[PDB]
């Protein structure tokens, strides 16, 4: 890619995946459910 | 052939058709959500979030007076060891439906912090993103209803999607209600 | 609200539920937002945002 | 067709039994002897878990499946997140817990800290820990209530056999970089 | 030849190191649990052992070995005797303890008995439990102190395996006859 | 399973097992776990015959609920032959009993 | 109920009678089984039997 | 089959349909049918 300017000398800068961790979770999480539905405002 | 049915008065009723314009905002306001994020320290799990530069987002691809079934407001979001990355608000407006849908990315917390205690000069691309969807189905207005009737229909609509929307986040903030959810369970009351 | 990550806390999921209401409050805003003197819902056929 | 039998019956029941998965995975013993240790080892050093019991990572609630995982990050200073995972495969009467945690390079993870420099550093192994039931076979004449009988007793073969392999001095070698074992006298 | 190392060192300690072996397997959990429900689940009869703890049949004090077995023999009322082995394989830093345990056909033993009749059976199967630990690639800095804690680690590892799989309601399936994994809602 | 006890398990040459428990234990039905289909099973044993199981299934789907009850006899001719003439024997089921009942 | 043995005198036939009779009532019971206070027959989509 | 011990020597475990009688009785039984149907229940 483009160059800059590191303390090594001028050097090329890059884009890696490289320590990032994507992984998720999954979904296996319960949630509250409502009694009963307000409708007040309408 | 005689035939059995059963009847109610009336006549099955004349549509007007979807053909009224509609109002479209200058700027979509976030302030709840940004005003939180500011709470929460845009932190929480291993999501980290970006600061905006606008709690209200102008428009991006709207020309004022230019009619437009789709249009998108959007700010842009930075932060230390982050890659700028833009956070969007939707509109479609088309048939009658009308449709808002805002999108806000996150980044690995984990990477930015390691790269922030090493003092190192990376910038992270986000991880992911969190999406809200809101839709009226405003379509099949009768034709005797004018256009003051057209009005109250209006604010109808909006104490419908304001129920809508407390009745989504309605609940105990003691317990678990939408993330990562699997199924509902109501309390034994 | 689908895929959240690894390291997220059992606590901060609650963080979480709550930054998805606040968005869910927000695009009901977005959604209705507009004066009363002026058609902005029902029978839409598309947006015409003001010149001023 | 229905037949007497004469001596042993060998007919073995299906393996097609739905059994129980935990909705998370605790690993108590072992983070608690990490903290322990303050996570370092001679030139292992480990990372810190976010939580000492795992989430599931790709298991959903009344969904079955013959393989889950659950997993957490482990993080640490000058280290980049490592996950930790442990590993649940349920087929054919078999099923099959594994355990496997990451460590890093100490002597690279203190000189960096000792220079004051930019860098951080990626894991550099792994220590893994297997432990597998063969429960296929049940005969035919077993019923539910029997099965449960047959399921206790497994898992208590399964805590004798943790005990033995684990059985021994802590004055003393017994499990790692292992090159033979050797009985003592008397 | 001596270099400087920038980065990750990764050389590992050859598996070289001798480790403790028991003078005997004791299984006194599964063997209890055995007495409890008076040796027959469903149509599995089991043995009676000679004893709970079991004394190596070709392991000698002070001679390296990398294969060794405990065994005891099962007797019973109808039964031919029948060997219940602990095997122990120690090589290349891996370390597995097995355990293998017969039954016999419950039907065909009280048949017999019911029939006042000279027959006697035979084994039908057995039902096994593996445990394994993977402690190879020390790392070249470990000292011998910090193997020990490298030994406890792993141990305690294993405990967290063996509860992980027995973990559940005893109300329900959870080992035997396995087919799938589930888990519950809520 | 009490009536079964009144008439000492035979009726004709049909004989029957004696249960395991007059309550069937569920064999794939996890607690908390939605099922479309799920059956309680009990073992039958009895002397010179081979065990077998009695079955009670539930099929639950689409607003219509199901339950089935199957029985298995045995050959009262070969048991008894069996066990007179002293022989080790064990003797498989010959047939079964089915009661249906559904709610829609 | 169909299918007696060869063998099956007419009066054990009357005793098969009242087997098929109870295995009626207690396939009943089963159906119905359950507290009031839950959900049990109508709009079935599925079962769910609880932990405790 | 499997091997077990008889008095004459170690023997083969066997299965046989021998001396087992699946003949069944034909449906030919008239059966008592109800004058009237009691619901009372419901």
Do not use: C, W
């Amino acid at each position: 890619g483009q160059l800059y300017m590191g303390q090594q000398g001028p050097v090329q800068s890059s884009r890696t995946t490289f320590g990032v961790n994507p992984d998720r979770q999954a979904n296996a999480r319960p949630v509250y459910l409502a009694p009963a539905a307000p409708m007040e405002n309408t | 052939p005689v035939q059995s049915s059963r009847t109610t008065f009336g006549v099955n009723p004349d549509r007007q058709a979807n053909a009224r314009p509609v109002y479209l905002a200058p700027a979509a306001p976030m302030e709840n959500t940004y005003t939180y994020l500011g709470s929460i320290q845009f932190a929480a799990g291993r999501h980290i979030f970006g600061e905006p530069a606008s709690n209200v987002l102008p428009p991006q691809n709207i020309v004022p007076g230019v009619p437009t079934k789709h249009g998108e407001y959007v700010t842009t979001n930075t932060g230390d060891r982050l890659m700028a990355s833009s956070t969007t608000v939707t509109r479609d407006v088309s048939n009658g439906r009308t449709k808002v849908s805002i999108d806000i990315p996150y980044y690995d917390r984990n990477a930015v912090e390691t790269l922030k205690a090493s003092a190192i000069p990376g910038a992270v691309a986000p991880v992911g993103s969190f999406k809200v969807n809101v839709e009226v189905l405003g379509g099949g207005v009768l034709t005797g209803t004018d256009a003051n009737a057209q009005f109250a229909l209006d604010e109808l609509l909006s104490n419908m999607l304001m129920d809508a929307a407390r009745i989504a986040q309605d609940g105990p903030k003691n317990t678990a209600r939408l993330v990562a959810a699997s199924h509902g369970v109501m309390p034994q009351a």
